[PDB]
Design a protein around this ligand. Structure first.
Ligand SMILES: OC[C@H]1O[C@@H](O[C@H]2[C@H](O)[C@@H](O)[C@H](O[C@H]3[C@H](O)[C@@H](O)[C@H](O[C@@H]4[C@@H](O)[C@H](O)O[C@H](CO)[C@H]4O)O[C@@H]3CO)O[C@@H]2CO)[C@H](O)[C@@H](O)[C@@H]1O
Ligand SMILES: [Ca+2]
Length: 237
């Protein structure tokens, strides 16, 4: 183990909490703020907690990153995550961007796990449909992306913690879920995935990815509701 965070506390030398207005990216409905990121207990576990809540028409959630604090290259990274039921517009993600000052997508982006996609609800598989992706290219105008979408065998939104893994070498990005290989992206000739990347976790609410960009269509977080995304640990081997 090169690095482990067991989330016994919020380590400010490793993580930064993000603050953003609603609609900052992807037509998302939440504001991100520091108050919606915490570390606390989930029974016997100590966990990172991203909390999405809705107060009338205002939605708040949490997002963190390790940019300029912890980054790596060509290692396996694994995280143990418990997800809320996403149906109706929640959008959790565990992902990475290049730890450099290039403007997205030129920094490079690896989406290890995303759930909540519009097509997942449309196929009645919202608890099982996972998206993994890579985005890259020199500018927003020249944004390229490769995606893989499929259903895992069992619900990932079942009240238990599940393991999401990235194995990374100079040729391949391999995503696994509960030790079952999900997809491999070939990056052997892709210049964007050969430098250090930092880690992100977030719980977005609505957004283009979900198909839900109008708060009136947001059934997955009703007025007065709070929902939590939990990360027991993250480690890099
Ligand atoms: O500095 C100039 C300008 O920056 C503005 O914010 C930018 C930010 O710099 C940029 O990194 C951000 O990029 C986001 C993309 O717009 C968004 O599409 C992408 O979404 C990703 C998906 O690609 C991925 O599949 O899944 C993840 C997880 O679900 C998802 O979030 O995310 C990138 C990274 O956040 O765009 C911002 C808005 O343009 C500032 O707001 C502005 O003041 C500055 O002038
Ligand atoms: Ca823990």
């Amino acid at each position: 183990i090169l690095f482990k965070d067991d989330f016994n506390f919020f380590d400010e030398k490793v993580w930064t909490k993000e603050t953003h207005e609603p609609g900052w990216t992807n037509q998302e409905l939440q504001a991100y703020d520091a108050a919606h990121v915490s570390v606390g207990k989930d029974g016997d576990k100590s966990v990172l907690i991203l909390t999405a809540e809705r107060k009338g028409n205002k939605i708040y959630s949490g997002r963190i990153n390790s940019k300029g604090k912890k980054s790596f290259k060509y290692r396996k990274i694994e995280a143990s995550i418990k997800l809320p039921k996403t149906n109706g517009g929640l959008w959790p993600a565990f992902w990475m961007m290049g730890d450099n000052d290039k403007q997205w997508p030129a920094c490079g982006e690896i989406d290890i796990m995303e759930m909540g996609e519009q097509s997942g609800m449309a196929a009645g598989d919202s608890e099982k449909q996972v998206n993994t992706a890579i985005h890259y290219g020199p500018s927003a105008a020249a944004h390229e992306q490769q995606y893989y979408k499929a259903n895992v065998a069992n619900s990932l939104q079942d009240g238990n913690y599940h393991t999401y893994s990235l194995d990374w070498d100079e040729n391949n990005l391999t995503i696994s879920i509960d030790n079952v290989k999900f997809h491999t992206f070939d990056i052997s000739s892709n210049t964007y995935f050969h430098d250090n990347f930092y880690i992100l976790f977030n719980l977005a609410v609505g957004g283009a990815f979900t198909g839900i960009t109008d708060i009136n269509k947001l059934t997955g977080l009703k007025d007065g509701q709070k929902v939590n995304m939990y990360i027991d640990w993250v480690k890099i081997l």
